[PDB]
């Protein structure tokens, strides 16, 4: 029984992480856009708003020094900028269009985005996996008014507890397999007190 | 043929594409056509920042430098008008493209030097009678360096310039005067200089690579110390095109 | 000075930690 | 709680500090003398749940001691050997803790904080390069401040201008 | 010594009053209301939409 | 930094005058008749 | 673990006290001159 | 006896005086690179950019901080969970301005305190003792993965993990606020009746126990010298303790059996700290604190406001001033 | 305070004619917008361009005005930037892309009205905090 | 002699009307008709020497003169300051709600 | 006046250490039997 607790807990802890990251066999379209996704996301939507205002993305400089909209990776591929630098490994179905051998394609960005990438994009940025236990969608200083948690955070976190007593129900029946197959899983033998019959640490 | 999952996390991103050794030819230039550079790109391979020595009499130097900011350097995409001049000098004019990478080096003994490594309206011309970019071909000219850090951003007493606080708020009561340079944020805008050696040209497909220099000032934190003068150092490569 | 202070106070405690682990009064039964 | 982050800094006091070591080592010391007891028990009776294996007449201990100890000291470097010292030791930690956070917060009655490190501000306030995790909590305390009081005061009639409130970028 | 007690007018003459820093605060805004408590003036954080600058 | 110039002495007999204090104490008791 | 032979009782009376005293402090008295200087 | 037979004899020897053991061959190593470099860079280290934006923070004594300002500093937003070891930097310059010390440190000292945690079993396993400590032991443990890995994996990136140092923690529980609003959720409120109700009992159980302790000594002597280390008879009257609790309350909320009651000792705390875990890993994946924010509406449909929306204005202000370089767009998502 | 008739008529048309909402359209109005706007527009703002508000005042300065029922029920069939040079049906829900947009697909006159007029109402109610964003919460 | 720019242009017709050289692209959603077409042919075609140089912009419709020519009252221009036209700010300037 | 800022501690360190060190051994000579 410990050995297949542990290995189930370890099973959720994999669960958690797939449902978190993975939208091939957990697609967006179903289970909502990943957190990366959702990040990325936004990043994309402001970019689109903001070129079609006139502005060029890729000489964009943000108030940090690094670009506003586009930036590089730590090994030179070109990433959306702002904090979902830290979602660059983020790929999907409406964002890959725009990406060439270097990353992100700032012709392709020009000139290529169509409106169903606007509209993904859009979605994707706006169903994000932030919410309240009582499914109040958005970031915990957001007004009630959209009712939404992310199927992704139930399954995530529901499966990351369970996961976790499992871990601990592996230590718990290991540790008593062990003492009872020993033989002293009720108790220390008064009379054959094992410490008792050892040197003294000191 | 390489693909992004062929390239991801390896470097080569952050590289510009090489010329065989065999592009040593001659690209026509007709002066009856207008031309663009496509792509400029421009890899940066050596950092140095003139050292401020004390007597101010004495020849100062550049000095080599660790870069600690990792692959994040180069300058790509870059597109532009290719103009052919009346002395048959051709001006490259920079419209647009990734044309700035903030960049921190770090000097021996520790004292990091960020800076705006960039090409920003760059404006640069060759020779006069250009009638084909050869190997012999360069181009010399300027751009812009504006600050490291634009408008809003917030130092960590949360003063600015276009936002943020204007006064040290922990020191209430402290005198203005001494604190003046760290209170009031101001915005530099200085000229670089860059050249450009076309060391490998294919003529056939408009594609010419070499090395490049350019000088320019670093980070002056928003006015609240003076710039290095940097000097970067590195290959370059450009598709000139018909328009 | 400070970093000199902090640093002492802290390699003090670890000695402590030696002499309060290795160089205890040994716990005997009666 | 949050008023006493923003407008006191509470956490940076070292009163309050004192009060969560002894708030937080006195429920160490609740699991950890519990849990040690429980598994040093001495077999007295032959069932598998093991506490009515237990009287409360009895005269001897329930669980060893001496075992304990060893168990300790090898795991630990340290270990009780005297129960009266550790008992006593179980009333002395969490007591002192709260009386220390006890004081503290007498001392923030008269807004008598420990807000700020004077040399931290003279550096930061110099040197705009300058940035540690306390400056970056005065940072958060600030727009506490400005952003809860109006209706947390309402007595204050404060009215803000949307162009005085301190925000970072975009947010 | 004293420097004497400042009046704050703006471009209209209307005079205006500095909204006193509450012992709670180890900082605060800088805001000017008219005698009725209308805001009248103040020191911005963010500028690119400050309507009651000094300045303005 | 611009520290308090009197923080030094300040944890160094913080630290000096209690700590001799118990080394005394345990000092002399060792010395005590086992 | 045997005992140490080898060692011995260490002692310093209430006059050697009293002259160890008066020389610190003498000594402090005259060199703090020249620490503070 | 050869020689790995006599080598696995003494890394499992029930005498030496501190146990080795096989967990104790991964702990010991693992948990000294962690606390060198722990130390080094407390002490040393240079400005660490930990979100990213070329803004470096200090966090050692030697570049201005104190011991309550002070940091071993989170590795950059740019760098997000990829793993960054020393031989992936060009340079330690390079490794120390993007924060690998602080990866090192923590995938040591995590690795060290699981194999703690499996070395307390395995000492109570030589020892011939029952199981369990370590299990206790699992809560706190649990707590600082999750706030070292399992937050940091949610929000993809090492950045966000809690930084090692004082200031920073607090740092960490201000935003952690911001955007979670845990103190609404209802596993911290759990864990604080964990550590709240542990410190009652501990209190509780050290008094009742002192309270009853069986005269044994004098006046003129410290009443501890009235138990002998080893001794069978128990050092308290059980019986005087449990009359007294259960006349301060009423006799069947007392506790009469002393495994019973140290039962209760261990789990209470350890459970409440189980959920303050699990608190902060669940709100890893934004399953944040109740959100009761405009909840109270009037008849027109005035917003009539509770004390939770003077939270969430509070909340607010940590929002909106955070990271304040660190954001180019309206919505903070990670 | 009560949501009386009075805060229930708003104008119909840009000719100054009102309609007079029920609470029962009151409430259909607020369902609706939840049900097909409210991701995006939650509390009168825009989140995916901020710079775009349902402001009764903003809509009002829209091209063609949008502060009327007719002007909102339009824009739900044929949405147009704010000077109505572009129709931007192709990026914003609307009936006449309810291909794209799906949720637009079980929407009726009826419930576009009522939308329409629950966007005209709750500024009425909310004020500064509808189009406000968090410095008005 | 240290000055912050920006508030110093507070000072000049830039904190009273829309900076045809200088404001940030949003501004133009104070008035009738000006956004986005309009705004975004504007900032591009920056800087003018005069107001009424604005309606000089190559390819503008007959109506979006007369637009441009109703709203020239709301219109001012000052030089170029770098401060608040580097970054791209003039297209998105940090600020949302 | 313009002292050497070290002069304090120094002072009370050289006053203080071997004074401890004496009283040390003072008292637990007295502490001894007989
Ligand atoms: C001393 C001993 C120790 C005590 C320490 C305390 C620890 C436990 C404390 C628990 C307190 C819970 C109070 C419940 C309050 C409540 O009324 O809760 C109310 C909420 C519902 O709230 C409503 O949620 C709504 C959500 O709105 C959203 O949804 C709406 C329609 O649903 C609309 O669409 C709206 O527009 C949209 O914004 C609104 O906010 C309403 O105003 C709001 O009242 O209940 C829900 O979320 C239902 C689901 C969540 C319930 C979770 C309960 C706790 C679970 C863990 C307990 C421990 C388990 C251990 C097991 C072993
Ligand atoms: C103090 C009192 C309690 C004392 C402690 C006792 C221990 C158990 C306590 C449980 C709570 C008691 C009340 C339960 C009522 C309730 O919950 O009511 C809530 C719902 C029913 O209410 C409905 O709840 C909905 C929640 O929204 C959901 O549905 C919405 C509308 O479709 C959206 O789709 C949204 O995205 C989605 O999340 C909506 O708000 C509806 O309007 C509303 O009617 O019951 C449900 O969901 C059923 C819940 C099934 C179990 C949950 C499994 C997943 C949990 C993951 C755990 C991991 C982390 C936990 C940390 C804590
Ligand atoms: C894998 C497990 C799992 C997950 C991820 C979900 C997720 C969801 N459920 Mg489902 N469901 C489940 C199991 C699950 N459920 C079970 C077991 C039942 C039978 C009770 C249901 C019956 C059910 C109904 C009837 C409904 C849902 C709904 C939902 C949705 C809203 C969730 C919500 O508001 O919860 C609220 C959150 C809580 C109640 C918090 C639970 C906290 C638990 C009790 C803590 C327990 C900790 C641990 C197990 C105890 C250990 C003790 C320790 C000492 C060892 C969400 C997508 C709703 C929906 O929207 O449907 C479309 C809905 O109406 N569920
Ligand atoms: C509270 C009780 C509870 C509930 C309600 C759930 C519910 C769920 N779990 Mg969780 N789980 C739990 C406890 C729970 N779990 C515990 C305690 C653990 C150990 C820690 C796990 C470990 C776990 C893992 C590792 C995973 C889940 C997953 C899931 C989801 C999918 C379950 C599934 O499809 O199984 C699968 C069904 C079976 C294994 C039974 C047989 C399936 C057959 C082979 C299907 C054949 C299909 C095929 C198409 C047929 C075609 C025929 C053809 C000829 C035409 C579901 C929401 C999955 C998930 O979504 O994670 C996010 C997942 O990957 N669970
Ligand atoms: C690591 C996390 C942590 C921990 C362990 C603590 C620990 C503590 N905090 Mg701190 N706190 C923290 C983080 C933490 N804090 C943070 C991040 C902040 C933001 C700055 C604060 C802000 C804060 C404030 C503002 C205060 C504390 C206080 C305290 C102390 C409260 C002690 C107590 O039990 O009072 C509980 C109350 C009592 C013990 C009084 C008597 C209670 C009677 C007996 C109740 C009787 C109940 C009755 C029988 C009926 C009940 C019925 C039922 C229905 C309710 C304790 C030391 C308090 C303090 O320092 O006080 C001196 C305090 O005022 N903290
Ligand atoms: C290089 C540099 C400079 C590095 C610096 C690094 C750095 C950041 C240092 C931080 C500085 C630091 C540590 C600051 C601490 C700040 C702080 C708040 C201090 C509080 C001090 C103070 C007096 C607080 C007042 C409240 C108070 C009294 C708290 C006491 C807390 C306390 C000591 C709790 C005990 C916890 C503990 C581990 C107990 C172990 C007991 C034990 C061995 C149990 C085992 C056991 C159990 C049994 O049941 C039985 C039967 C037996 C037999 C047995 O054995
Ligand atoms: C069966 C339910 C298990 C629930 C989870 C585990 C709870 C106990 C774990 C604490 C471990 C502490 C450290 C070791 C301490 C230790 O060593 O344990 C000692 C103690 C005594 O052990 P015994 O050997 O006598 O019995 C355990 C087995 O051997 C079975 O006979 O163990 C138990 O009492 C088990 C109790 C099971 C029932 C407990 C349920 C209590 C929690 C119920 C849920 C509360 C949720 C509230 C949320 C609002
Ligand atoms: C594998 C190695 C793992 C452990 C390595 C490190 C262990 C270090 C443990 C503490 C050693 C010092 C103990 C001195 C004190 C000492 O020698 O204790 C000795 C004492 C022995 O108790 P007895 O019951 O034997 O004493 C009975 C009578 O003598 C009473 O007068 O132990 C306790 O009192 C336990 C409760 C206090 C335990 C306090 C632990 C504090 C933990 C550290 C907190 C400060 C850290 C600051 C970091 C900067
Ligand atoms: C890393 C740095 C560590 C620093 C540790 C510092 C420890 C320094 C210990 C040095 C203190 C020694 C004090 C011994 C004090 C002391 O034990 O004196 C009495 C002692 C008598 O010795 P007996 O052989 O009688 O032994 C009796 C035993 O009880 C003593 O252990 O004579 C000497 O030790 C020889 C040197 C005498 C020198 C004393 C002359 C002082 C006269 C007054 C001078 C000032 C006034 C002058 C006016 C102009
Ligand atoms: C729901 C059906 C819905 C309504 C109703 C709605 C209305 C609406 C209006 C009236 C405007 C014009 C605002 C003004 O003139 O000031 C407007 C503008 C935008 N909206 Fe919208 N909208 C509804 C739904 C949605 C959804 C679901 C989104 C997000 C995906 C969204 C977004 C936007 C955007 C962007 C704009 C600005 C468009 C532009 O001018 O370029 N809306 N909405
Ligand atoms: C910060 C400044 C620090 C300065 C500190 C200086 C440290 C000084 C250490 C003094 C050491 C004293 O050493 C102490 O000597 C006495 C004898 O004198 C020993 O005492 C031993 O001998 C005597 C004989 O009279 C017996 O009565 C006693 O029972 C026995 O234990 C102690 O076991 C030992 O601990
Ligand atoms: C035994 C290891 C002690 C820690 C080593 C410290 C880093 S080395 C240290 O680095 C500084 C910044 O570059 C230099 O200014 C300084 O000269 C140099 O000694
Ligand atoms: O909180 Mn708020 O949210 Ca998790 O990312 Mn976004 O800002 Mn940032 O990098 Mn540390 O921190
Ligand atoms: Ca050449
Ligand atoms: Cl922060
Ligand atoms: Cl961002």
């Given at each position: 029984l410990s050995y297949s607790l542990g290995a189930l807990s370890m099973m959720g802890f994999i669960a958690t992480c797939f449902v978190w990251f993975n939208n091939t066999v957990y697609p967006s379209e179903f289970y909502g856009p990943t957190g990366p996704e959702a990040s990325q996301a936004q990043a994309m939507t402001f970019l689109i708003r903001d070129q079609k205002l006139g502005a060029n993305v890729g000489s964009a400089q943000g108030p940090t020094g690094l670009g506003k909209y586009l930036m590089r990776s730590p090994t030179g591929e070109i990433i959306f900028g702002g904090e979902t630098m830290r979602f660059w490994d983020f790929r999907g179905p409406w964002l890959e269009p725009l990406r060439g051998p270097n990353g992100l394609d700032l012709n392709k960005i020009k000139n290529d985005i169509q409106p169903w990438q606007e509209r993904r994009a859009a979605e994707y940025m706006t169903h994000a996996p932030l919410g309240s236990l009582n499914s109040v969608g958005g970031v915990a200083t957001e007004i009630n008014s959209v009712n939404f948690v992310s199927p992704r955070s139930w399954l995530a976190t529901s499966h990351f507890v369970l996961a976790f007593f499992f871990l601990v129900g592996h230590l718990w029946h290991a540790g008593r397999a062990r003492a009872a197959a020993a033989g002293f899983e009720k108790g220390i033998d008064r009379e054959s007190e094992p410490v008792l019959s050892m040197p003294s640490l000191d | 043929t390489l693909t992004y999952d062929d390239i991801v996390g390896t470097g080569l991103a952050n590289k510009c594409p090489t010329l065989d050794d065999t592009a040593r030819g001659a690209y026509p230039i007709d002066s009856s056509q207008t031309y663009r550079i496509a792509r400029l790109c421009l890899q940066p391979t050596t950092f140095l920042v003139k050292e401020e020595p004390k007597n101010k009499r004495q020849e100062a130097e550049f000095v080599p430098t660790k870069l600690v900011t990792r692959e994040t350097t180069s300058l790509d995409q870059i597109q532009g008008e290719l103009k052919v001049n009346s002395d048959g000098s051709l001006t490259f004019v920079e419209e647009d493209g990734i044309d700035f990478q903030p960049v921190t080096v770090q000097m021996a003994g520790g004292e990091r030097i960020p800076l705006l490594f960039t090409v920003k309206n760059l404006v640069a011309s060759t020779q006069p009678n250009v009638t084909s970019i050869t190997t012999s071909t360069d181009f010399k000219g300027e751009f812009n360096v504006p600050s490291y850090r634009t408008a809003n951003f917030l130092d960590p007493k949360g003063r600015g310039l276009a936002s943020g606080y204007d006064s040290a708020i922990a020191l209430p009561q402290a005198k203005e005067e001494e604190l003046a340079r760290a209170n009031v944020k101001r915005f530099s805008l200085t000229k670089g200089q860059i050249s450009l050696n076309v060391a490998k040209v294919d003529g056939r497909t408009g594609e010419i690579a070499g090395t490049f220099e350019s000088e320019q000032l670093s980070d002056d934190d928003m006015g609240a110390h003076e710039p290095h003068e940097v000097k970067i150092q590195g290959v370059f490569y450009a598709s000139i095109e018909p328009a | 000075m400070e970093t000199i202070t902090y640093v002492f106070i802290f390699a003090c405690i670890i000695a402590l930690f030696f002499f309060a682990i290795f160089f205890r009064e040994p716990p005997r039964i009666t | 709680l949050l008023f006493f982050q923003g407008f006191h800094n509470w956490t940076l006091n070292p009163f309050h500090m004192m009060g969560v070591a002894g708030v937080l080592g006195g429920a160490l010391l609740c699991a950890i003398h519990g849990a040690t007891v429980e598994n040093t028990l001495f077999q007295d009776g032959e069932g598998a749940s093991t506490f009515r294996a237990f009287n409360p007449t009895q005269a001897e201990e329930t669980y060893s001691m001496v075992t304990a100890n060893r168990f300790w000291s090898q795991i630990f470097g340290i270990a009780f050997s005297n129960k009266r010292w550790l008992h006593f030791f179980m009333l002395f930690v969490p007591v002192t803790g709260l009386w220390m956070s006890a004081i503290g917060v007498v001392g923030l009655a008269l807004?008598?904080?420990?807000?700020?490190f004077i040399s931290q501000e003279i550096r930061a306030a110099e040197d705009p390069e300058f940035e540690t995790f306390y400056t970056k909590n005065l940072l958060l305390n600030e727009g506490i401040r400005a952003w809860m009081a109006p209706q947390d005061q309402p007595h204050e009639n404060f009215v803000f201008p949307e162009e005085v409130l301190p925000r970072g970028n975009a947010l | 010594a004293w420097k004497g007690h400042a009046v704050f007018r703006n471009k209209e003459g209307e005079e205006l009053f500095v909204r006193r820093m509450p012992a709670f605060f180890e900082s605060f805004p800088v805001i000017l209301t008219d005698k009725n408590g209308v805001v009248k003036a103040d020191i911005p954080f963010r500028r690119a939409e400050s309507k009651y600058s000094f300045e303005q | 930094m611009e520290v308090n110039q009197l923080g030094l002495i300040a944890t160094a007999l913080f630290v000096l005058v209690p700590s001799v204090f118990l080394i005394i104490l345990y000092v002399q008791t060792e010395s005590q008749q086992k | 673990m045997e005992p140490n032979p080898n060692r011995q009782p260490v002692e310093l009376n209430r006059t050697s006290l009293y002259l160890g005293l008066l020389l610190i402090l003498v000594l402090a008295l005259l060199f703090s001159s020249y620490f503070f200087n | 006896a050869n020689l790995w037979e006599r080598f696995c004899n003494w890394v499992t020897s029930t005498d030496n005086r501190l146990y080795v053991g096989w967990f104790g061959v991964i702990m010991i190593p693992t948990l000294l690179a962690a606390t060198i470099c722990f130390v080094i860079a407390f002490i040393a280290a240079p400005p660490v950019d930990i979100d990213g934006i070329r803004e470096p923070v200090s966090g050692s004594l030697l570049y201005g901080n104190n011991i309550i300002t002070g940091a071993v500093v989170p590795s950059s937003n740019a760098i997000g969970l990829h793993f960054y070891p020393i031989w992936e930097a060009a340079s330690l310059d390079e490794w120390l301005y993007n924060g690998g010390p602080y990866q090192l440190i923590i995938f040591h000292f995590l690795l060290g305190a699981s194999c703690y945690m499996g070395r307390q079993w395995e000492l109570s396993y030589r020892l011939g003792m029952r199981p369990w400590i370590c299990v206790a032991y699992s809560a706190p443990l649990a707590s600082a993965f999750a706030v070292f890995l399992i937050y940091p994996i949610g929000q993809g990136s090492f950045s966000d993990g809690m930084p090692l140092g004082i200031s920073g923690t607090f740092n960490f529980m201000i935003v952690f606020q911001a955007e979670h609003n845990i103190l609404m959720h209802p596993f911290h409120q759990l864990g604080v009746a964990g550590v709240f109700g542990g410190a009652l009992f501990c209190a509780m159980h050290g008094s009742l126990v002192t309270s009853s302790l069986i005269r044994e000594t004098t006046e003129t002597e410290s009443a501890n010298y009235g138990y002998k280390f080893g001794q069978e008879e128990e050092t308290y009257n059980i019986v005087a303790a449990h009359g007294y609790f259960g006349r301060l309350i009423f006799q069947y909320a007392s506790f009469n059996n002393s495994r019973s009651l140290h039962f209760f000792l261990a789990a209470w705390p350890v459970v409440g700290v189980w959920f303050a875990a699990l608190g902060i890993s669940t709100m890893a994946f934004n399953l944040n604190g109740f959100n009761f924010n405009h909840s109270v509406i009037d008849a027109k449909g005035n917003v009539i406001n509770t004390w939770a929306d003077i939270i969430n204005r509070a909340n607010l202000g940590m929002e909106v001033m955070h990271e304040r370089n660190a954001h180019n767009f309206p919505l903070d998502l990670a | 305070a009560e949501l009386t008739p009075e805060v229930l008529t708003v104008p119909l048309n840009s000719e100054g004619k009102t309609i007079t909402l029920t609470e029962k359209q009151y409430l259909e109005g607020k369902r609706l917008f939840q049900y097909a706007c409210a991701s995006c527009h939650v509390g009168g703002i825009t989140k995916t361009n901020p710079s775009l508000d349902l402001r009764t005042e903003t809509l009002a300065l829209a091209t063609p005005p949008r502060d009327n029922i007719e002007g909102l029920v339009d824009y739900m069939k044929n949405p147009t930037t704010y000077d109505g040079e572009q129709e931007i049906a192709e990026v914003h829900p609307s009936l006449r892309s309810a291909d794209i947009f799906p949720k637009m697909r079980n929407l009726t006159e009826k419930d576009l009205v009522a939308i329409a007029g629950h966007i005209l109402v709750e500024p009425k109610i909310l004020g500064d905090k509808w189009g406000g964003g968090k410095v008005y919460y | 002699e240290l000055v912050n720019v920006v508030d110093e242009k507070l000072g000049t017709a830039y904190g009273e009307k829309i900076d045809l050289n200088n404001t940030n692209i949003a501004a133009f959603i104070q008035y009738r008709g000006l956004y986005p077409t309009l705004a975004k042919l504007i900032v591009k075609n920056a800087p003018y020497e005069s107001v009424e140089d604005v309606l000089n912009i190559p390819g503008l419709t007959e109506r979006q003169k007369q637009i441009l020519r109703e709203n020239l009252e709301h219109f001012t221009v000052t030089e170029v300051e770098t401060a608040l036209v580097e970054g791209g700010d003039r297209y998105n300037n940090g600020l949302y709600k």
């Open positions: - | - | - | 807004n008598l904080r420990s807000y700020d | - | - | - | - | - | -």
